[PDB]
């Protein structure tokens, strides 16, 4: 079973040919959240009279856009190969 | 347009049933149309009702058929009271609130052929649809 604490996050500029430059692991605090959600449309006949029809139908219509959030400590450091300062999430 | 091949029929139970069909050429040359009866000499009609569209569905009846007039271009098909009574026990048990007598019975299909072959083609599907039975309380 998927345990949330085992979660790891990688971001990339690309779908393929991932490398140490186009792709970056990031730290998180354990307050991460993510997901996607469904919009569903329900219809029923409004009827008069003594012996009305009664049922209903519904249809899945569309999805909302996916949403994500996470939080991170600010952590400036010196890039060991260049002597420049960076933070791990500069790509963001 | 399309041929309007799809037609559905209702049979009144405990009473004989018959349908007549006439084949005509038509020329639209003048306002009263130049319709002409087709010669039906040496043609035959077949048709059956089955409970569902399947390889081994139950068969309820075969139509009685004949040509009444080869030159008026008229064929007829019919069902006896014995056939339609055999229908009325095997059609389904649902009834509509506003229309309690009407019950679904099955699917039907009318097929015509030349009695002596043209060989390149030999038959065609005239018409098709489904059959409902109307319950009745007299004999």
């Amino acid at each position: 079973l998927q345990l949330l604490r085992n979660t790891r996050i990688f971001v990339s500029t690309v779908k393929t040919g991932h490398d140490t430059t186009n792709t970056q692991e990031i730290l998180v605090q354990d307050d991460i959240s993510w997901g996607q959600d469904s919009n569903s449309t329900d219809i029923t006949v409004n009827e008069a009279g003594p012996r009305p029809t009664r049922g209903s139908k519904r249809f899945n219509d569309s999805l909302n856009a996916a949403e994500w959030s996470f939080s991170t400590y600010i952590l400036p450091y010196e890039d060991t190969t260049t002597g420049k300062q960076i933070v791990p999430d500069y790509m963001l | 347009s399309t041929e309007n091949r799809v037609i559905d029929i209702v049979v009144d139970e405990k009473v004989p049933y018959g349908l007549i069909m006439q084949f005509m050429d038509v020329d639209d040359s003048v306002y009263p149309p130049s319709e002409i009866p087709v010669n039906l000499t040496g043609y035959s009609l077949r048709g059956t009702i089955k409970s569902s569209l399947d390889e081994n569905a139950e068969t309820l009846a075969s139509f009685t058929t004949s040509i009444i007039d080869a030159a008026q271009g008229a064929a007829a098909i019919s069902l006896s009271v014995a056939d339609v009574t055999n229908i009325g026990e095997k059609a389904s048990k649902e009834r509509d609130k506003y229309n309690p007598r009407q019950r679904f019975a099955g699917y039907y299909d009318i097929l015509m052929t030349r009695d002596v072959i043209g060989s390149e083609v030999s038959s065609f599907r005239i018409m098709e649809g489904k059959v409902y039975i109307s319950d009745g309380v007299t004999q």
Binding site: I43, G49 | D8, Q102
Partner: protein, 296 residues
């Protein structure tokens, strides 16, 4: 002392009797005066101040919304509208001997003698629907004259009783019930015109309308249904306009019958397909009937 609609009262006076429509749900009214006005520009003097005079009371419209009442007193509205009456039955006469509509008289009453009186009036419309709600009857009236007054005729036994309980509508033809109703709406009319009477004899007097003549009557209805078919090839519920249909509409307590009618159809491809029937009597049709029944 102010005044308040929430404790206003309406009394109808006719035939030397008076009707207390206690169960009023709403009403609306205006009153106004007509004026003649000219500015008389003139190259001697380009006058800027207008010359004007007030001449006449405008014919007020009146509008009422009334709930159906056990003891049925509101049937007198149809009686005044000009239906003939046979106990609780009402009939349209196929042709009519009236020329003037039935004139009658109205008090509006309030606390502190703060009363108003409308002297000559006639009914122009009665209109209602059975649309899945407590059936409310609208009335349109006109009146030719008004004044304020300190007093009113008492009325106490002819009081509109308690409201009748709800019940669902049915529509039928020859005892066939009609599937999938949505609504029924009815209207009845007595179109009239006032005869303009103003004369040079009336100069420097205020003028009123005094008489009107009946132009027309109408009875008509609308029905809304869901579109339904029995089997695909059926013909009975097609779009095409039927004619000479006998048609009957009722609740538990009210019944309306058209012995023969002409039906227009309109179809709307809303999310569920809807059909509207427009109903009218045929020229040869017999008298349309209306009945009322009191709940126990």
């Amino acid at each position: 002392y102010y005044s308040l609609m929430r404790e206003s009262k309406v009394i109808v006076e006719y035939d030397g009797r008076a009707f207390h429509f206690d169960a009023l749900s709403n009403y609306d009214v205006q009153t106004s005066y007509e004026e003649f006005k000219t500015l008389r520009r003139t190259i001697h003097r380009r006058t800027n101040y207008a010359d004007s005079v007030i001449n006449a009371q405008t014919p007020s419209s009146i509008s009422l919304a009334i709930n159906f009442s056990n003891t049925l007193t509101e049937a007198n509205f149809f009686e005044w509208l000009g239906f003939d009456r046979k106990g609780n039955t009402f009939l349209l006469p196929l042709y009519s001997n009236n020329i003037e509509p039935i004139m009658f008289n109205i008090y509006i009453v309030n606390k502190d003698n703060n009363c108003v009186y409308f002297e000559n009036c006639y009914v122009s419309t009665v209109d209602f629907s059975l649309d899945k709600n407590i059936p409310i009857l609208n009335v349109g009236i006109e009146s030719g004259k008004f004044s304020e007054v300190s007093t009113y005729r008492e009325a106490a036994s002819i009081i509109q009783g308690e409201a009748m309980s709800y019940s669902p509508v049915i529509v039928s033809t020859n005892g066939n019930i009609l599937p999938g109703l949505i609504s029924a709406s009815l209207s009845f009319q007595q179109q009239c015109s006032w005869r303009e009477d103003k004369s040079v004899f009336d100069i420097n007097k205020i003028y009123n309308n005094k008489r009107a003549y009946v132009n027309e009557m109408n009875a008509s209805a609308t029905i809304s249904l869901y579109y339904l078919k029995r089997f695909a090839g059926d013909m009975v519920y097609n779009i095409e306009p039927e004619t000479d249909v006998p048609l009957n509409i009722r609740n538990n307590n009210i019944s309306i019958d058209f012995p023969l009618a002409r039906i227009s159809k309109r179809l709307n491809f809303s999310d569920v397909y809807k059909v509207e029937w427009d109903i009218i009597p045929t020229a040869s049709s017999d008298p349309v009937r209306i009945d009322f029944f009191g709940e126990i």
